[PDB]
Assembly symmetry: D2
Homo-oligomer: 422 residues x 4
């Protein structure tokens, strides 16, 4: 039925998934020609496989293709794409922003394309060398942040399509007001009605069906911390509304936050998504268990996702042994996609700060230490020390030789210093 | 004469500089209105001040805004923009390329714009906090790679203008064939005639004059390693042509490479640039001395630039003492701008490979080690641990409060996990 | 006080203008260095002078730089930048969209920059030829559509800065919900509270102040046709809410649309903008006079803007004589800025349909007809038949000669077919 | 062999085509995963069909998605993508440029993507309306300008690939030096060696092969007017080099231009391309015939392309009857793809100059005239008078209703002024 509209969709893919629209709606709305989105198909099927096969799938937020590549090289099986990081250092306004849906709605998909393209080059490099891949596949699935959909259902519809074209495997949408969107761990968050978010999720699903891809949808609730709500029109929200307190000057309703609205919303969103995610204030396994248990009484076996946030101070909140076991324990509760949202930002910024500081103090000695550390990391699989090969110089050499039937006088690698000193 | 066309130019800025065009040419070709390029002016003049006053100015190649920001935070006084790194991970084709001028000609200027924008936000943040700046200025000059001009004099003209609008302080142009451009440390480089490169330096100078900015121009020569030359039409190149080899299948001449043609070309380029740069195969102080000495006999006091390249295996070529004193010794020779081209690429890629590998093997324990390392760096100047502040959340909060006369219910910081846990 | 923060502002620029923020807020929020935005300065001041001195300043919607260039060549003194047209054929998602704020927020300012760049080349070409300009200035002020600000006040603030950087002279904001934004002339518009739109207007002003430019702000109301409102929280909107009908399933309030809420909203917005604009359902001079009279009772001498929409059927509504005097009459009521929003889209799409149709039918005969019509327009100031000159070939030839000391072997124009076959 | 690497390539697609590289080279260089390029397949297979079945395929240069949409609605069967037009008003440096490869190399492919996306929306609109399409197909093949390939063979390889991703059906490359590229109808053109252009052509083909698409390659020569050559290294160019004149100051060789070198270069390029094209100074049937006949002596049946350039003054060159038959005559010679390169630019700029001028003189009367003409064109098939439908407002309404099960309050069309005033 829907399975014939999404040919790559595996058996069971849409078990327990409801749609507001019909199969006929999809045919009517997808135009007259078949256009393939291969990287979206592959990515979404591979993610589906991974989350059902592994203990759990864990990821880090990448802010560049290069970061994604090294993640995959090191053996990670998925890539997370943070909207927070897109705002900070990788968006289409070429500015640094806080995490408030300030940048243009195309930014996220543009980064997802960047990441897939770098992985494609990684793949082309190793395929040309003819000794097989150094990894399972270069095309690890990307799970990406669509924030609040950048407005209404149609904005959700459009960003979902954009992500699919860019080759993302999964996409997450949160029940905040786009016009006042915040980082989950900032104050002042404003919820939209349960129904209004079900519409965005359904828009995402319609986009996927219309593109013909089995793209995963992750529903996120920001209700643990959020104390404001745009409208009480939905009876499911009304019980958490503090009527005595009245409306704010902006017209917002005031609500009781915490695990209870997260449970209610999560259960109401369950049929319209593939994974559910509750933002939390602290890395708390007991809270995580409590949420997992309540969701699973209503929807046994529902797959969950968890944000291992750098907005948390880890060693303050937890002891060393709990830190060690954290993701493993979450995995056994059903949290099959886990991610450190802002890893890329922290790694990039600390690393460069520490190098620039050392460079100021001792100039070239500071750089030699990095280089030597790079050299020592090769036993463990690091290859970027040979930077020419890494970025594809040898691949493009072989492209040249094939074009000229071998007779190019201007090949790069033979007389390089990389060949002579590495 | 030119000083009135470039009002921001300081006294003696153009001492010993020659132009092919006249001041009247500039008035004819600059349009009828005055358009200011504030960051290009400030950057050019600051870089001019720095390179004369300081023993040497050293830099690192930044591939993103955030990297640039941390460099300036750490105390570095200038920023290098690497074409190699643009090709690798930061271009407008959204692909990973080797260093062969494959990406679209606008990519460098776009990254320059990103860097200045990130710096601008950083300056906005601290200005709004109202306790003064933590640096001398956030607007550290950017010295940017225009590669081989992306074609002819008109292409050189255009990329220079683009860099000026993006707010670059200095721009380098090399004497390679754009259609076969390579990294300076790879094989198969093809030089263009001495005359042809002077045409591009002059295109670039006219660009700055027409824009009304005292932008610095750095002429680079790749003759140390290049064994090919497109044409022997310039008598200055003929003495290095191996007429016994014959031409190559592409019609290129074969030349004898080494320091002799770098000196010749450098001396010939000196009147049409502000600094001169010879690419080297090894980090060799005696070679740098010999080059500096030769250049200075013809042109006393000429300012030089040097690439401290990651394409060298530093510990294999030099002992610890020579590495430690390397830049200082170059400085005393007149190499007043020195830069590690690929630092951003090696920090980003090393750092993430290592993080991703620890994360694979030990999950949150690996990430907590980074975070703890971040906190520990706070004593030395590090700030990105408080990531919400770093990217401008506090700044935009203050914007919101000015907009709403102080009444907004949806500000980010007060009830953030940042404010509670950091 | 604010005049020292905005050095280019002429005397009286901010007369009658209220601000939520202080001059200290501006100094605190603008960074430690001075950055200049030359085209924005020039555009804003020239637009300010034109709207005070001319009977009325009229414009057409440009969807490309070339379109804008011909408008200025033809003698128009301002340019309109339509969001509808951005959605249709000129946005940063490379897609055709209906007019519902579906494209990325940077699209408008990117088209503004394109337009100013074309005008810049046009000016360089003529400056380089040395015979003076064929127009008053190539840098006609651009007035540009910021739609609903693409979200809240901070989104409004950002699009304003983007437009200032791109060289926009004026920017308009409308009291619709960004997330459900529509063309003024479509159904299903949802208004935001009067207060919330005043927030967006002030964000815009703070933006201009912080950038240090006297950019014009045009406040638009969509209350003539809008039957929905996000919230009744603002007492000023409660007199128009139909409480009998209830809220929609989405929780929107239903309101009584028309001239009255437009008048009220407009009067509330007045102190926070430089021009006020009420979208209308028909080209109706009587309604336009009523609106002008009411606003002027509250705020004498307030400048207004009128949309001469192609979404109207003009001959169906009006006779030839009313159509002929329409903009003149509006000018006297105080409508000092008047624009045909979708002019670019209709001329582009009509023109090519008809050319393609003739081409299918009779191949080169259809094109030759266009070419002769171009020759025929030259007497009236048209220059684009000589296309090589128009796009700057001659300008860059002169650049190359300055570089090469007059010696290059590869100049383009002397041996071109333009020089050989397009002599008088 | 190559047919298994390019699954959608029809029988005989590569008859008579030579390659410097091998099937195995392709396998080695294309990576380990099959990525599909649907619109480029459909486009290339469609262009191939049309050029073998129609008397000739004629096209106009579109500088925007909207322009291309009206072209296809009007009944034209292909779209030309001009680099000249990209330079003028549609490039990724957001500037007006002359036609000299000064814009960034991604600009043409970006425009190709825009065109395909508009056409896709047009198709979506009609498919949702349910009455069938009003055109044979909305996805008319795009033939796109790759100019001088923006550098060496690797640059050609990359631009070819970008065009395939954008959905182009065919791409053209010219034997000029990219660093001093010009419009064919300007002076100061510098050619590259015959061999050097053949490598660009093969680079393009290797890209198509590696992408697994049967994209058409069109080889252009600028030898008719070009009097300069980078190098005389290729013995095929040497008979046309004026050695007595010597090299120019830049080191260029000087050559006898004209139809003879075009014929020789065309004959050499022929195995490395699907169509050949000679730029001309005048629209001259005799010169066209001489070119076609000489190329066909060496390569019977070779398809040709002809630029019907606005850089010509048409009525100054030709009488009304020769203008009238021009394209049909060329068709009979084997010129199966013909195109008015700068059609989009002239239409856009003429039309708006005249609109603006009328508007200055008499304000709304001028615009009302446009609107009436639009209404009058509806009988002939014009629809953009209803601009809201045209850009897909109706389609997105239908999207909302599917999202909300028919229950949106905020749909656009029912109460629009389009519905009320254009009935
Ligand atoms: Mg996020
Ligand atoms: Mg470089
Ligand atoms: Mg609009
Ligand atoms: Mg062309």
């Amino acid at each position: 039925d829907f399975y014939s509209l999404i040919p790559s969709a595996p058996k069971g893919r849409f078990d327990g998934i409801e749609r507001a629209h019909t199969a006929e709606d999809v045919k009517r709305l997808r135009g007259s020609v078949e256009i393939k989105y291969s990287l979206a198909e592959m990515g979404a099927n591979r993610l589906w496989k991974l989350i059902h096969e592994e203990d759990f799938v864990n990821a880090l937020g990448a802010l560049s293709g290069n970061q994604a590549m090294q993640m995959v090289r090191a053996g990670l099986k998925a890539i997370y794409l943070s909207g927070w990081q897109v705002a900070a250092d990788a968006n289409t306004a070429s500015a640094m922003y806080p995490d408030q849906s300030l940048y243009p709605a195309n930014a996220g998909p543009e980064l997802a394309k960047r990441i897939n393209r770098t992985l494609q080059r990684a793949d082309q490099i190793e395929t040309a060398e003819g000794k097989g891949l150094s990894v399972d596949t270069w095309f690890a699935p990307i799970v990406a942040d669509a924030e609040a959909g950048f407005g209404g259902p149609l904005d959700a519809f459009e960003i979902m399509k954009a992500y699919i074209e860019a080759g993302a495997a999964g996409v997450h949408f949160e029940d905040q007001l786009a016009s006042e969107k915040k980082c989950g761990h900032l104050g002042g968050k404003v919820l939209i009605p349960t129904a209004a978010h079900i519409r965005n999720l359904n828009a995402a699903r319609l986009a996927a069906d219309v593109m013909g891809t089995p793209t995963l949808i992750v529903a996120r609730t920001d209700a643990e911390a959020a104390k404001l709500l745009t409208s009480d029109i939905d009876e499911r929200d009304q019980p958490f509304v503090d009527y005595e307190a009245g409306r704010t000057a902006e017209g917002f309703y005031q609500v009781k936050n915490g695990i209870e609205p997260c449970i209610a919303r999560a259960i109401a969103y369950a049929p319209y998504c593939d994974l559910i995610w509750m933002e939390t204030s602290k890395p708390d396994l007991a809270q995580a268990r409590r949420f997992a248990e309540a969701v699973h009484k209503a929807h046994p076996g529902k797959l969950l996702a968890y944000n291992c946030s750098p907005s948390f101070n880890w060693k303050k909140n937890l002891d060393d042994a709990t830190i060690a076991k954290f993701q493993r324990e979450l995995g056994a509760m059903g949290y099959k996609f886990q991610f450190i949202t802002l890893a890329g930002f922290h790694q990039l910024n600390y690393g460069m700060f520490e190098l620039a500081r050392g460079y100021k103090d001792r100039q070239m000695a500071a750089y030699s230490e990095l280089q030597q550390a790079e050299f020592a990391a090769e036993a463990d699989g690091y290859t970027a020390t040979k930077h020419q090969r890494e970025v594809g110089t040898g691949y493009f050499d072989a492209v040249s030789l094939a074009i000229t039937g071998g007779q190019s006088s201007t090949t790069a690698m033979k007389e390089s210093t990389e060949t002579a000193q590495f």
